[PDB]
Antibody, heavy 216, light 210 residues
Framework: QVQLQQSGAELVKPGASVKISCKAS????????VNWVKQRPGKGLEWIGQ????????NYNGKFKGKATLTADKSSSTAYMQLSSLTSEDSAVYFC??????????????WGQGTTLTVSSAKTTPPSVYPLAPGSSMVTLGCLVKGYFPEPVTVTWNSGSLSSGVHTFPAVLQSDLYTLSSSVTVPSSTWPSETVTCNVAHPASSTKVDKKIVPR | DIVLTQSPASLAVSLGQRATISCRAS??????????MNWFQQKPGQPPKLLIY???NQGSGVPARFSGSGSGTDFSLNIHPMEEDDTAMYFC?????????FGGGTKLEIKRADAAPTVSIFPPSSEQLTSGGASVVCFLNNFYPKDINVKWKIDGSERQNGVLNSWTDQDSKDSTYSMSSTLTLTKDEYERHNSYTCEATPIVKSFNRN
């Protein structure tokens, strides 16, 4: 199938540059424009520019001229976007997207998954992971993932096999550190007679933690 | 540049009913009878997904409950019948003139019957106490409508400092909302009090520090 796969999240200090990639598969990469789009954490969508990989021609939004540089590598079917002289205003999710011809309103019809850029001088900090058991017919358990930077973390229950009855809440930022929580609700016949475990990964600090939820 | 203005910014619609979202452009987004107006849906953590291209054409795989109308500067997206998984952000977009631009977005949510939260309160973990901190966590899960008030009490007195709240986006299956509220104290402050209460407005859950 038609697919665009983007590079991973990056944390960079103000003043640096970064280059994000978008690898295409499932179609003739040279023949369709590749577009780049910015979405600020809680905001709308802005078009940065586009490149035609077959010949390297680019059209830019003037708002991003001298901030963004678009290139392409035909041989590996990969488009690149470099962002320079970075500031906190560049912290955002960036998407690549294939667009179609005028027969299709020149619409986007395939998107990469997004790459999150964090531009900050704050220091990478791993989470503390705290299991939440009741003070003690359904029982709710929790996992508090406190004091990490940058985003994201990944939280699962029982290595992902416990997926129903879960709520994982958006992180909150305070004093350059994030905190989030996750709840899981299970039948009382399944805990603590059976085991429930919170699994947390924080890729930016190369940390993985498993904490069983132990009855009190 | 072409500015796209969406109306309304937020909309709530009942299951089975019709949602209409409007997009007005500062200048025409058509030429030669072709429209360069496109509509997208975006769910949390995902890229936008095409619904309607060139004003009125369903994208590949897009259901007939989505339709588009308009020409020149005036466009609209219709969804009928509304379904639970249609809770999402919706954007119009024009590809007529570089730079391509998007509307500001419309948050479309589903109406349903009111539901009280399932409330759970948790003392600080022993692990956190060994490092000198004490977070008390309260979950208020699967409620409707989204507007809810959480109140903390310590030994009977309302407590507002040290509280941080987070809300989920509307559930795509049951149309409810959930929230977490965390009260963070030092270990020494936590150990100075006995009863900790979380209230939803009330539904009350408490524990006593033992």
């Amino acid at each position: 199938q038609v697919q665009l796969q983007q590079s991973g999240a990056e944390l960079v200090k103000p003043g640096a540059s970064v280059k994000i990639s978008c690898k295409a598969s499932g179609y003739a990469f040279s023949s369709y424009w590749v577009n780049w789009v910015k979405q600020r954490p809680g905001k709308g969508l802005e078009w940065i520019g586009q490149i035609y990989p077959g010949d390297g021609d680019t059209n830019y939004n003037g708002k991003f001229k001298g901030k963004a540089t678009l290139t392409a590598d035909k041989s590996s079917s990969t488009a690149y976007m470099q962002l320079s002289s970075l500031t906190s205003e560049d912290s955002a999710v960036y998407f690549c997207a294939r667009s179609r011809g005028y027969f299709y309103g020149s619409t986007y019809d395939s998107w990469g998954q997004g790459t999150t850029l964090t531009v900050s001088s704050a220091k990478t900090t791993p989470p503390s992971v705290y299991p939440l058991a009741p003070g003690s017919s359904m029982v709710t358990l929790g996992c508090l993932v406190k004091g990490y930077f940058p985003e994201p973390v990944t939280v699962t229950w029982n290595s992902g096999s416990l997926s129903s009855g879960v709520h994982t809440f958006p992180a909150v930022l305070q004093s350059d550190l994030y905190t989030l929580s996750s709840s899981v609700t299970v039948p009382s016949s399944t805990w603590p007679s059976e085991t429930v475990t919170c699994n947390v990964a924080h890729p930016a600090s190369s940390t993985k933690v498993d904490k069983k939820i132990v009855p009190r | 540049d072409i500015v796209l203005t969406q109306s309304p910014a937020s909309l709530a619609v009942s299951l089975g009913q019709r949602a209409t979202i409007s997009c007005r452009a500062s200048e025409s987004v058509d030429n030669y009878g072709i429209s360069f107006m496109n509509w997208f849906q975006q769910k949390p953590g995902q890229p936008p997904k095409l619904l309607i291209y060139a004003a009125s054409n369903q994208g590949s795989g897009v259901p007939a409950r989505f339709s588009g109308s308009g020409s020149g500067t005036d466009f609209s997206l219709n969804i009928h019948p509304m379904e639970e998984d249609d809770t999402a952000m919706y954007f119009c977009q024009q590809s007529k003139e570089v730079p391509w631009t998007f509307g500001g977005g419309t948050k479309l949510e589903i109406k349903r019957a009111d539901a009280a939260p399932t409330v759970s309160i948790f003392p600080p973990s022993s692990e956190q106490l060994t490092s000198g901190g004490a977070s008390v966590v309260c979950f208020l899960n699967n409620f409707y409508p989204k507007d809810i008030n959480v109140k903390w009490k310590i030994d009977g007195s309302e407590r507002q400092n040290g509280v941080l709240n987070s809300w989920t986006d509307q559930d795509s299956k049951d149309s409810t909302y959930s929230m977490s509220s965390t009260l963070t104290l030092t270990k020494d402050e936590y150990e100075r009090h006995n009863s900790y209460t979380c209230e939803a407005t009330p539904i009350v859950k408490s524990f006593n520090r033992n």
